[PDB]
Amino acid sequence: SGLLELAFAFGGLCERLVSLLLNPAVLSTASLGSSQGSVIHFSHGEYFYSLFSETINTELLKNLDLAVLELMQSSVDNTKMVSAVLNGMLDQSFRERANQKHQGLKLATTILQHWKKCDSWWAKDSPLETKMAVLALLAKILQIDSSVSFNTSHGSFPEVFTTYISLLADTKLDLHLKGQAVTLLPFFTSLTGGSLEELRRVLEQLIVAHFPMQSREFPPGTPRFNNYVDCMKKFLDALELSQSPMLLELMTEVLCREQQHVMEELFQSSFRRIARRGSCVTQVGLLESVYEMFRKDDPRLSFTRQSFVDRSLLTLLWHCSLDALREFFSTIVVDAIDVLKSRFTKLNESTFDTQITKKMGYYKILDVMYSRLPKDDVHAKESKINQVFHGSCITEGNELTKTLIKLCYDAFTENMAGENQLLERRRLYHCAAYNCAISVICCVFNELKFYQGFLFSEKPEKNLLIFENLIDLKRRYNFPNGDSDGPSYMSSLSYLADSTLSEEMSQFDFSTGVQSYSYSSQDPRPATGRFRRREVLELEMDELNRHECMAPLTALVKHMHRSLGPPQGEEDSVPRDLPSWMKFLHGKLGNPIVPLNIRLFLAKLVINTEEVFRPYAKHWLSPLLQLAASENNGGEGIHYMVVEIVATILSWTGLATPTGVPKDEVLANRLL
Amino acid sequence: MAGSGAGVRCSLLRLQETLSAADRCGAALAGHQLIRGLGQECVLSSSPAVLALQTSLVFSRDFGLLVFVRKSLNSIEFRECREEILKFLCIFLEKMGQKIAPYSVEIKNTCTSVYTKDRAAKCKIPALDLLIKLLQTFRSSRLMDEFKIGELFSKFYGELALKKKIPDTVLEKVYELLGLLGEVHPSEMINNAENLFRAFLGELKTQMTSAVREPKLPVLAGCLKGLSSLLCNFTKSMEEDPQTSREIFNFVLKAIRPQIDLKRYAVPSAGLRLFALHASQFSTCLLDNYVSLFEVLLKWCAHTNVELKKAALSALESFLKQVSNMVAKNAEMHKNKLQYFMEQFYGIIRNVDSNNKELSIAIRGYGLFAGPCKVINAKDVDFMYVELIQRCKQMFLTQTDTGDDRVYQMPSFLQSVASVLLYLDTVPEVYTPVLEHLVVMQIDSFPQYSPKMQLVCCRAIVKVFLALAAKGPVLRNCISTVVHQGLIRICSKPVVLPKGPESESEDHRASGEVRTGKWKVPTYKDYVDLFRHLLSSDQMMDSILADEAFFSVNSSSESLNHLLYDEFVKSVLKIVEKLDLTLEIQTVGEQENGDEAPGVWMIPT
């Protein structure tokens, strides 16, 4: 090596070195050890470059332009040696990155300047191995450029883009090569439309060709399922690195083809990660893309339209940015309200359900930006949101919240007697409005809330429940995975200035082109509190606890108990009556002629977060006890509803005693 | 926990005292409950050496089981509990490997005395399974060497005289015991062997009878098991036997024959066991009917049973190995068989809707049938290599991990890609990184195997290293990179804590939300055996040389020890040079001018 360094330092013999490297000469040798007894053939240039690789790479990077020019001038008949030398130079430039900066970028630009010399490499009717070599070289160039000098226009973009598109469109490539291409996707994501929609077309063609309509056609353990999940995870990683609105559109279209996706957790985690990371403009662009997907008149079924909001848009909205939420709200104020106040059709069944779904989705969206936004914008003096059609910053108050709460109240107060076209969809529509109204109410005003019920044959309780589904409450809460993230790239994929061995493992992957995954200590890897909780309810298998409007209303009840109502510290706070909401719930629960599901709903409401229920005691002791001791209940035997009711009502002893009054003593004896 | 010895001694004394006063002894009671209780206590014992006292108390004087069953000789229709005693003994004998030999002779004497005057059934089968489990205790012939086999053979052959109404459940175990008389010690069973084999073959022929007569399916399974046991030790090679072994393979061949009635298997399992253990003994018997044999073994490999699955896999492996051996020996005239086998393998491999077991057998066939493929045509091995490498990249070098073994099959695939790499004139330059990643991941996944699978893994690594080093100087550099990367990955694992690891197996971890997998974290000491085996490769060298037929009979190719040692020292020096071991002080800071005194500098040291 020292003699080679001296020989190179003597003059400028770069041409001789490329020439002696790109030289066909076979050096016959005997069998290495004992293999066959015949001779072993190997090239002179390959051996010479294999031994003293570093010196040749260093002096070729010294005279970069001439070396690249000669190498790509002789790259028609020596494709093995040219690829080997180019890869060696790229690895050499990737090493010493923190000190020898701008050498790798210069090498990548110089290589990209002569793509027409490698045009005959990736073309049609070419060997597949040569195409994989072209893909690997292109990947190395893209990572070593770090998306600094390569972009649309002024970068010889058409040749590279045509190469990438032709690599994608080839039908002979296996799924792993297309997966490497999908890994290379984020470098081409700065599209400008027009002719660059061909990327979208070939991506959709790939999705149609290799992805099944249902995600259950491949049984677990089959190689087809593993390849499918690998391709999906590569697509999701490309989305995360990309933040492309097109990629989000494609993956949501794929995800919403079925109610349950085998890799739904990965989809939601990727959506929440791209919602957390980024800038304001990217977030509003992504939200606008999903919103325009949702509000488009296409022959798409109702559950797919519901899944566009419930699974995708909900996560992005909940993990969005504060100002992006405000801008999205200001964008979507006008259309949502006129949609909510719009009249119905009730003529064609295909038009009924889409209108119902659109109203339900708009209610959920407004629920989200009322739950996550402060009161200083929805209703205040300097409100950036201008709901009024006239606008011009005139008047003051709230012409938005009043109309929204009025529309929600009208949605609750719906008389469905004699109207039987679709019931469950509206059941959701009524529950959706209630939760939207609760989220609006929670952060606008204080004191006593809106009047409840009012009768006139329009009560929220009958509209929010099914009245026909018998809840199968078992003896106890019991008897109501997939593919996981798999291994990780720990101590690899990045130097991170933390470990040199990790840096060598990260260069092994760059050189070989295949990422390395070790074995993780624990199969589940919770990075943070993502999906664990939002910004005590450890029982999800119950139907009454997994109700659309049970979780919101209980949160509303807990909000009533804290920082609202009479000040704390009351001793024997009115043990002769109840407040309007409490006494309303008492009347609906204490009455024995109301359907069973309402009584079960209110009883489970009382059981959950029993702190608020315990004050005003010796009052709620009886309506729970009548339900506990009754022939009509959640089921036969001592089911867990009875167990919870009995535990709560016996833990209330001392403060309240079911004695003295003969009405409850008989029922207590019956219960015993 | 500690009082079990006193309790078991008290129970033994009570059992000894039970056979007094009234000879009824509570009829079926008052002994059965005691036997069941002592058996439950014995099987519910502890792990440490406390069991030595109770094992010595079990095999002891009058307050013992052996003296009890010896004195139970006059139990005419009395004390129907000796079978439970024998079952407990065989369970206990299975539970603990007999520590000392003077107890084994007493055990076999007691079971032989049980054999005498054994009325009807329900005790003969316990006695025979006790004897069967006893004969597997030594496995080295250093104990049980007084050689009473002559009297046992004479008695068993005397039992063959009746042959009228012996129970089927008894006859099968009797013939299994007759088969078990072999593989005990040499210079025995060499004079009566011919008569015994003639009687066994005639009895089996009468068992099938080749008619609509009663087949006696339990008897046939025991006959095949005894046949396999006899063929295990004695050669009986058909190469010198043209007539009496063609029928002994035909018997197996009709035993393999599937049917709708499962009949609790046994009879289609003993035949596959015999084939698997004795395929080398039917040369050309397998060849003359390869298509049917292959399809039937594949059909048995595609089933739902577990033991039958293992038997089918082993039988198919032995068949394929024999066929591969004969074709590699005579690849010139043997071309249609190779064409059929490799066409089936090609179809299975290219079938993208394949399973793991079918892919495994296809890859094994790829590995076995390489040399004949090379001699027929040079361009086939390249396609085999590229397809195998693509499949290995698809299945192993992936992040998916839905959940499976996915690591208990890598050595079986590495040994198969090693053969195709050995039989390649030129190597595609683009799959070398894939091969390097495969070998590095195989090295990393070492502490996830049983010891035998660990030895298989090191043998696979040795074979791949030989294939890599027998190709060219550049592939030696690939070997060097593989070794260096493996050393880096081993060194990057977390450091063993200097503090004591407390009591081993103290609990079952936190057991969170579905905490399974049992992925034990490796340490530096978990990889010690692998590199010792790498630097001591002579035994694996001769094992591979005996297994495969290749030009490797020379000490030059054997010198993988020097190569691997040099790579180890070079990697150690490289890691030492590249590592950054400088150290500084971080509790203090620079740019101090008139600030708080603790914030300027620590007291001088």
Decide if A610 contacts A557 (C-beta within 8 A).
Answer: no
Both tokens of B80, joined, read 């129907």
Residue B520 domain-assigned? Answer: no
Decide if A469 contacts A597 (C-beta within 8 A).
Answer: yes
Q: What gap in Å lies between CA B325 and CA B120, rounded to an integer?
A: 51
How many angstroms from the chain centroid is the CA of residue B465?
26
Please compute Rg for chain A using Cα positions.
34
Q: Following CA atoms A262, A266, A267, A269 in sequence, which dihedral angle do they give, to the nearest 10 degrees?
A: 150
Residue B490 domain-assigned? Answer: no
Angstrom CA distances, A290 to A15, A294, A317, A329, B204, stand at: 57, 6, 11, 14, 76
Residue B214 domain-assigned? Answer: yes
Q: What gap in Å lies between CA A138 and CA A181, rounded to an integer?
A: 10
Q: What gap in Å lies between CA A481 and CA B135, rounded to an integer?
A: 46
Q: What gap in Å lies between CA B318 and CA B25, rounded to an integer?
A: 56
Q: Following CA atoms A480, A485, A486, A487 in sequence, which dihedral angle do they give, to the nearest 10 degrees?
A: -140
CATH number of domain containing B81: 1.25.10.10
Both tokens of A31, joined, read 């069998």
Residue A493 identity? L
b/e sequence A632-658, b meaning 16+ C-beta within 10 Å: ebbeeeebbbbebbbebbeebeeebeb
Please compute Rg for chain B using Cα positions.
32
Decide if A156 contacts A112 (C-beta within 8 A).
Answer: yes
DSSP secondary structure letters along B422-458? HT-SS--TTSHHHHHHHHHHHHHTGGGS-HHHHHHHH
Q: What gap in Å lies between CA B471 and CA B422, rounded to an integer?
A: 8
Q: Quick one: which of B271, B277, B278 has its CA closest to B257?
A: B271
Q: What gap in Å lies between CA A86 and CA A92, rounded to an integer?
A: 10
Q: What gap in Å lies between CA A358 and CA A184, rounded to an integer?
A: 37
Q: Quick one: which of A310, A323, A411 has its CA closest to A369?
A: A323
Greatest alpha-carbon span in chain A: 114
Q: How many residues does the structure list for chain B?
A: 605
Q: What gap in Å lies between CA A262 and CA A483, rounded to an integer?
A: 8
Q: What gap in Å lies between CA A240 and CA A271, rounded to an integer?
A: 8
Residue numbers in B near A42 (CB within 8 A): 472-474
Helix ranges (H only) for B234-378 are 246-256, 267-277, 290-301, 307-329, 336-350, 356-368, 371-376
DSSP secondary structure letters along A396-448? -S-SSHHHHHHHHHHHHS---TT--S-SHHHHHHHHHHHHHHHHHHTTT--SS
Which one of B422, B558, B578 has the shortest CB-CB distance to A500? B578
Hey, CA dihedral for A428, A430, A434, A437, is it positive or negative? Answer: positive
- Taking the Cβ of residue B582 and every Cβ of chain A, the question of whether any pair is shorter than 8 Å is answered with no
Q: What gap in Å lies between CA B221 and CA B251, rounded to an integer?
A: 11
**Which one-letter DSSP state was computed for residue B242?**
S
PDB resolution in Å = 3.3
Which one of A136, A483, A505 has the shortest CB-CB distance to B488? A505
Neighbours of A469 (CB within 10 A): 11
Angstrom CA distances, B212 to B206, B207, B208, stand at: 12, 11, 9
Greatest alpha-carbon span in chain B: 113
Query: Taking a contact as any Cβ pair under 8 Å apart, which residues of chain B between 339 and 358 contact chain A?
Result: 352-356
Inter-helix orientation angle A157-169/A198-210, to 10°:
20
Q: How many residues does the structure list for chain A?
A: 672
Decide if B389 contacts A514 (C-beta within 8 A).
Answer: no
The CA distance from A396 to the nearest CA of chain B, in Å, is 53
Q: Quick one: which of B75, B57, B73 has its CA closest to B13?
A: B57
How many angstroms from the chain centroid is the CA of residue A139?
27
Method used to obtain the model: cryo-EM
Residue numbers in B near A520 (CB within 8 A): 519
Residue B532 domain-assigned? Answer: no
Q: Can you state the percent helix, strand and coil of chain A, rounding each to 5?
A: 55, 0, 45
- Taking the Cβ of residue B577 and every Cβ of chain A, the question of whether any pair is shorter than 8 Å is answered with no
Q: What residue of A is the nearest CA neighbor of B422?
A: A35
Which residues are CB-contacts of A342 (< 8 A; sequence separation ≥ 6)? A355
DSSP secondary structure letters along B146-197? S--HHHHHHHHHHHHHH-SS--HHHHHHHHHHHHHTSSS-TTSSSSSHHHHH
Decide if A229 contacts A483 (C-beta within 8 A).
Answer: yes
Decide if A314 contacts A368 (C-beta within 8 A).
Answer: yes
Decide if B45 contacts B7 (C-beta within 8 A).
Answer: no
CB-count exposure of residue B235 (10 Å: 0-12, 13-18, 19+): exposed
The CA distance from A509 to the nearest CA of chain B, in Å, is 9
Q: What residue of A is the nearest CA neighbor of B432?
A: A512
Q: What gap in Å lies between CA B323 and CA B285, rounded to an integer?
A: 11
How many angstroms from the chain centroid is the CA of residue A215?
17
What HEC string does B323-355 produce?
A: HHHHHHHCCCCCCHHHHHHHHHHHHHHHCCCCC
Q: What gap in Å lies between CA A373 and CA A369, rounded to an integer?
A: 6
Which residues are CB-contacts of A289 (< 8 A; sequence separation ≥ 6)? A245, A248, A249
Angle made by CA atoms A177, A180, A181, in degrees to the nearest 5: 90
Question: Based on the structure, what is the number of domains in chain B?
Answer: 1
Residue A319 identity? H
b/e sequence A29-45, b meaning 16+ C-beta within 10 Å: eebbbbbeeeebebbeb
Which residues are CB-contacts of A588 (< 8 A; sequence separation ≥ 6)? A461, A594, A598, A599, A602
- Taking the Cβ of residue B470 and every Cβ of chain A, the question of whether any pair is shorter than 8 Å is answered with yes
DSSP secondary structure letters along B84-119? HHHHHHHHHHHHS----THHHHHHHHHHHHHHTT--
Decide if B462 contacts B543 (C-beta within 8 A).
Answer: no
How many angstroms from the chain centroid is the CA of residue A318?
11
Q: Quick one: which of B364, B361, B384 has its CA closest to B374?
A: B384
Decide if B275 contacts B252 (C-beta within 8 A).
Answer: yes
How many angstroms from the chain centroid is the CA of residue A8?
56
Q: What residue of B is the nearest CA neighbor of A50?
A: B474
Residue B296 domain-assigned? Answer: yes
Residue B553 domain-assigned? Answer: no
Q: What gap in Å lies between CA B251 and CA B256, rounded to an integer?
A: 9
Angle made by CA atoms B575, B578, B584, in degrees to the nearest 5: 115
Q: What gap in Å lies between CA A296 and CA A284, rounded to an integer?
A: 18
Which residues are CB-contacts of B219 (< 8 A; sequence separation ≥ 6)? B168, B171, B172, B175, B207
Q: What gap in Å lies between CA B295 and CA A409, rounded to an integer?
A: 72
The CA distance from B1 to the nearest CA of chain A, in Å, is 35
Decide if A44 contacts A23 (C-beta within 8 A).
Answer: yes
Decide if A537 contacts A608 (C-beta within 8 A).
Answer: yes
Which one of B397, B422, B519 has the shortest CB-CB distance to A514? B397
Decide if A203 contacts A248 (C-beta within 8 A).
Answer: no
B401:A225 CB<8 A: no
Decide if B157 contacts B149 (C-beta within 8 A).
Answer: no
Q: What gap in Å lies between CA A634 and CA A626, rounded to an integer?
A: 13
Q: What gap in Å lies between CA A347 and CA A343, rounded to an integer?
A: 12
What HEC string does A12-56 produce?
A: CCHHHHHHHHCCCCECCEECCCCCCCCEECCEHHHHHHHHCHHHH
Q: Quick one: which of B410, B391, B438, B364 has its CA closest to A224?
A: B391
Which one of B400, B448, B559 has the shortest CB-CB distance to A486? B400
Angstrom CA distances, B341 to A602, B284, B319, B327, B344, stand at: 71, 16, 12, 11, 5
**What are the residues facing A39 on neighbouring strands?**
A30
Hey, CA dihedral for A440, A444, A449, A455, is it positive or negative? Answer: negative
A132:B430 CB<8 A: yes
Q: Quick one: which of A473, A605, A594, A489 has its CA closest to A542?
A: A473
Q: What gap in Å lies between CA B135 and CA B90, rounded to an integer?
A: 11
**What are the residues facing A29 on neighbouring strands?**
A40
Phi, psi at B271, each rounded to 5°: -65, -45
Residue B578 domain-assigned? Answer: no
Residue B456 domain-assigned? Answer: yes
Q: What gap in Å lies between CA A572 and CA A475, rounded to an integer?
A: 37
Q: What gap in Å lies between CA A211 and CA A253, rounded to an integer?
A: 12
Q: What gap in Å lies between CA B267 and CA B272, rounded to an integer?
A: 9
Which residues are CB-contacts of B405 (< 8 A; sequence separation ≥ 6)? none
Q: What gap in Å lies between CA A643 and CA A647, rounded to an integer?
A: 6
Q: Which domain holds residue B318?
A: 10-482
